Amino acid sequence: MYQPVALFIGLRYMRGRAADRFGRFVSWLSTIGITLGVMALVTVLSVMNGFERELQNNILGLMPQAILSSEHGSLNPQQLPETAVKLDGVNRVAPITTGDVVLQSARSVAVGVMLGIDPAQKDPLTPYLVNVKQTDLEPGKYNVILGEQLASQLGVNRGDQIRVMVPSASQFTPMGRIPSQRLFNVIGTFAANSEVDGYEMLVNIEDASRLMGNITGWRLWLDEPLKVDSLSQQKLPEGSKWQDWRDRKGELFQAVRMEKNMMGLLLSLIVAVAAFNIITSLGLMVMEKQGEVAILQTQGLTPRQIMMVFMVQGASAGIIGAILGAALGALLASQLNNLMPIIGVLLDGAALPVAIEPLQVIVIALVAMAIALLSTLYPSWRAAATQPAEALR
Amino acid sequence: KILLQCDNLCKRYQEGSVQTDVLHNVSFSVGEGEMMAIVGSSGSGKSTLLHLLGGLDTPTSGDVIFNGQPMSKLSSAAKAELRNQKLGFIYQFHHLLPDFTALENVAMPLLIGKKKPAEINSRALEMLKAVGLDHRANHRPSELSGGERQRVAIARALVNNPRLVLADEPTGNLDARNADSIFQLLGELNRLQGTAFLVVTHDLQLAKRMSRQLEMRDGRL
Amino acid sequence: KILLQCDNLCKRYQEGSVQTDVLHNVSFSVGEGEMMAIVGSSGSGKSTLLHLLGGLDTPTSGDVIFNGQPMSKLSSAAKAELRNQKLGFIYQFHHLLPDFTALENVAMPLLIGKKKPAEINSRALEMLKAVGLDHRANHRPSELSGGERQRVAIARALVNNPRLVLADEPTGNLDARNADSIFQLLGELNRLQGTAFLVVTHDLQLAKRMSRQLEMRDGRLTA
Amino acid sequence: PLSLLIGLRFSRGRRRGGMVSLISVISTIGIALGVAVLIVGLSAMNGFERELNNRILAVVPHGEIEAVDQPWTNWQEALDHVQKVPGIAAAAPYINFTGLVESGANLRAIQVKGVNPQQEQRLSALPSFVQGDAWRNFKAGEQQIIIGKGVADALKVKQGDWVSIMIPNSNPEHKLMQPKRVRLHVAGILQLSGQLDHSFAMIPLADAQQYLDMGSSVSGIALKMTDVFNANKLVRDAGEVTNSYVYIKSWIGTYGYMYRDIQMIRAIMYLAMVLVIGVACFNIVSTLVMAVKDKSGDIAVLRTLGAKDGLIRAIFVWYGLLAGLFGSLCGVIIGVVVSLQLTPIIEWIEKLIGHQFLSSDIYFIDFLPSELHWLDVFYVLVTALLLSLLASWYPARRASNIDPARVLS
């Protein structure tokens, strides 16, 4: 659209240079100086947003928020119908049974907690089932679903008899106090991609052997997996309590958001030191290019116009090298396992993920460009004082 | 009539940490349609004299005038308006821009004044063809010969159509065949509009120009 | 007897980005007690020939020998061992160290060869007083005159008692009084031992010499 | 005695002006801008650690043991068992009282507790945090209550009146409790750091046995943990005072905000704040390549005297160490004179902008301390010489392949 290009003088000074001269050498040292900082900085930025990618998708996207309990013990379903449970933010209800149990077999021991459901309803939290049918959950055979990682340390495959025991929620015998021993066979295993221990078993709600057949409470799901503080002190009926929430899992939702604010805002001194290499690159062109300033001072050049030549030339050197750090940052996007060979230290688990965000490019290119406009002031002022009488004719 | 009036420009500064008497009491007067060809020597301060008349340094002894505009009233930004419009500067110390092309170098004084881009390109084309260099317009001055890039610097000061062209020895860096041809290009400017040119001389190569040859050896007539 | 035998000296490189035969087949011989005075012009081939005889570069045409040791059997580190034991270099434009004093400039080859530090400072004092410069020991070479900073460079190569002193025309910024008086000092090196020296001549200063006043026009020896 | 091995390093870059000296000014203050932040920025994180264990973790207790509606009658066998347990200071009681205050249109949880005044100098620092010169008014029998600072400016409970607060106690029925008038005059006021100034009140032992309406006993026994800086093995052994069931309540649970983010910031500063020294090492490369173009004739003198090839490369190695030592020496001096008097600096620039920021509403403290330790100063001087050795390897190899036949020697 025929833009008024007034930066044509500074673009030719940084393009038409030789290779054997010493002025082209220091410009390369500066270019690879910013590229080191920007790239090593976007590598930390990629692995910090990768922790947000791994969380709330398959690690923190299957945990519940709040459960319903009572004070008199269990809950009678015929007095609390489905038309009376109306809360703010809830969308689905399901009965559930609680109680801490312990595994008492002839091989090893394990501690876990059951999860009572019905074959008519399906849980929307953990749909990852390794050939587990939600319909085949009849309580007449006393079946249970065992996790994959709990069955590996126990060494029991599907189709075997495993005895369970509960210390607390057993049969309240009027004469004594006996432990509830129930034969809960495993006919199928499942894996829910749990980096947590994950010792949850799946039982049926029709089990009149734990306590008193009634249930303990209902499930209250919520479509806000980040915070529950906006819907905590709401209207609640009589006979309901408040339980724990997302405050005890991995990283506590604190070690990523605080570290990103410390690396993005407080750690902005990388480009402040890297701007001094631009002053070295723009400070050597007043010695090998003394004659061109003498030509641009005698034919009617104002002192205001000569300040706008080295400022754009100092900003043109800050663009190249900073965009190379964004180009090398995209090179590590497809690097998942090949970038880290075996030098002994491996650190298995969820150590180094990758996540490229498009909104993190403008925040890292604006700080690397605006700090070069205020830095190029001392080489821009000392070149205007060079009169064409003592240096060159 | 009168363009520049030198009134005792004694340049007294630390020329190499010593006070020299090379530029002492220089005072002459150039006309408008006519001019002056100062015959000097190598070391008398011919290049030093044209720097003081153009407005590059201050002598702190006297003051000159330019059609009723003295240099005491001209600031640093006001001298840039005088050097760009009505002052031509021809030099001889390889004063070209090798980064730009030969077309942009002639158009460079017009690019400072920020005129219409149609009249910048057309004025540089007719000035390059006056010295016979329109076929080398889009060419770098680094690959040009010595008898070709010198004529670009001569045509670099005639695009603004000045009144006093302080030429610092334009003849001597090129051959004998093109020395006579560029004498008419300075002579045709007297016929169209009357552009004066104060040329310095130390090998007596401007002896046949006019009658006014003042021998100012070390500022002494 | 013999020190350095020249066989097929054709230094062929891009001399001014062209390939010219200015230094082609320069074959001569220096003696243990005998010296040579090569006569030529200002900067024709004397600047290149003095660089090749000390071991600064390879001509890739032939080879030179030094007391039975040729340059072809010397590596990059082994060639530096010959330029310090029995070799000297004198130049024209006062090739000294300007950031150091005149006392430490004399004992510069003594500090590289890892010698005893007691005899390093004593040898620098007797070499400074040999040219009449012991009173200007703790001084800078930059603040000296023209004929003062030249005489300290001639007493720098002969400190470690070499066998061949490659002097590249020591006549120069020094005056006419210290022009012939320095020649008897270089003559004193060959009167007590077998320290030869190669001097080149441009404006016929070294015509009063021993026997070998031959001219060399572009690698071709004449009368 | 000194050790002068090669003297061709201190008197090698001796300059008196020009273009080589212009790079050495920017290379000095360029690396000094890095070291200045690693001193005044790490002293603020080291100052946050000493303000917690000495000021915050001094008056707060560690572990409490409660019961589910049962008075702790067996306080004699629980007292004798804890006498020979390692990591104790004293045996202080701890009673709880819920509260609902409706006065002056305010809703705040007033938490009260009882601490024996005989054992108070070896558990916390009570007499050092006092306003009056005479602190001899904290005895029993006179019924003298004391309040904090957070409630005095809004609830008109300043010293001089008779503060009577309606508090709910334990009862067999679950209804609205009695509004008993507390006839306890106030005398004296404590002072905290703006965190425990609205839920901190002290009651006498002979006076607290008439407001609970349960019995002449104590419902909870507290304990003091003398082991500091970690609580891992000091909470597993303190679980047999009660029955087989446990009641976990530690100081790391309710105060999990601090003492974790302080060590996490300094852990990144051992790998991210050292990154700016590697970028600052590129200025050492740009100032060592300019000492070759002007001293090109100086190396040609040494090559004619028969110098070792490893000796010429060893000149620019020690030349880059001396250029990196002088640029890093000024960064420590500018960091000491700021971190020692940081509190007049943060109050001088805040009053010039007009409205002040960084208040105390979500944050913990309005101002910041600065503790200068001799541990982080040594970590900067190690990496300033190791990273400069990698940066000076390339000018030491570029200036070694220069032949004297090319230069006019």
Swiss-Prot record, chain B:
It is an enzyme of class 7 (translocase). Its main location: membrane. GO terms for molecular function: ATP binding; ATP hydrolysis activity; lipoprotein releasing activity; transmembrane transporter activity. The keyword Membrane applies. It is found in: Cell inner membrane. GO terms for cellular component: ATP-binding cassette (ABC) transporter complex; plasma membrane; plasma membrane protein complex. It is a peripheral membrane protein. ATP binds at G40, S41, S42, G43, S44, G45, K46, S47. SUPFAM superfamilies: P-loop containing nucleoside triphosphate hydrolases (SSF52540). Keywords: ATP-binding, Cell inner membrane, Cell membrane, Membrane, Nucleotide-binding, Translocase, Transport. Changing G40D: Loss of lipoprotein release when overexpressed. PANTHER family: IMPORT ATP-BINDING PROTEIN (PTHR24220), LIPOPROTEIN-RELEASING SYSTEM ATP-BINDING PROTEIN LOLD (PTHR24220:SF689). NCBIfam families: LolD_lipo_ex (TIGR02211), PRK11629.1 (NF008639). Belongs to the ABC transporter superfamily. Lipoprotein translocase (TC 3.A.1.125) family. This is Lipoprotein-releasing system ATP-binding protein LolD. The gene is lolD.
Swiss-Prot record, chain D:
It is found in: Cell inner membrane. The keyword Transmembrane applies. The chain crosses the membrane at residues 22-42, 272-292, 314-334, 374-394. It is a multi-pass membrane protein. One of its GO terms (cellular component) is ATP-binding cassette (ABC) transporter complex. One of its GO terms (biological process) is lipoprotein localization to outer membrane. One of its GO terms (molecular function) is lipoprotein releasing activity. Keywords: Cell inner membrane, Cell membrane, Membrane, Transmembrane, Transmembrane helix, Transport. Part of an ATP-dependent transport system LolCDE responsible for the release of lipoproteins targeted to the outer membrane from the inner membrane. Such a release is dependent of the sorting-signal (absence of an Asp at position 2 of the mature lipoprotein) and of LolA. PANTHER family: LIPOPROTEIN-RELEASING SYSTEM TRANSMEMBRANE PROTEIN LOLE. This is Lipoprotein-releasing system transmembrane protein LolE. The lineage of its organism: Bacteria, Pseudomonadati, Pseudomonadota, Gammaproteobacteria, Enterobacterales. The gene is lolE.
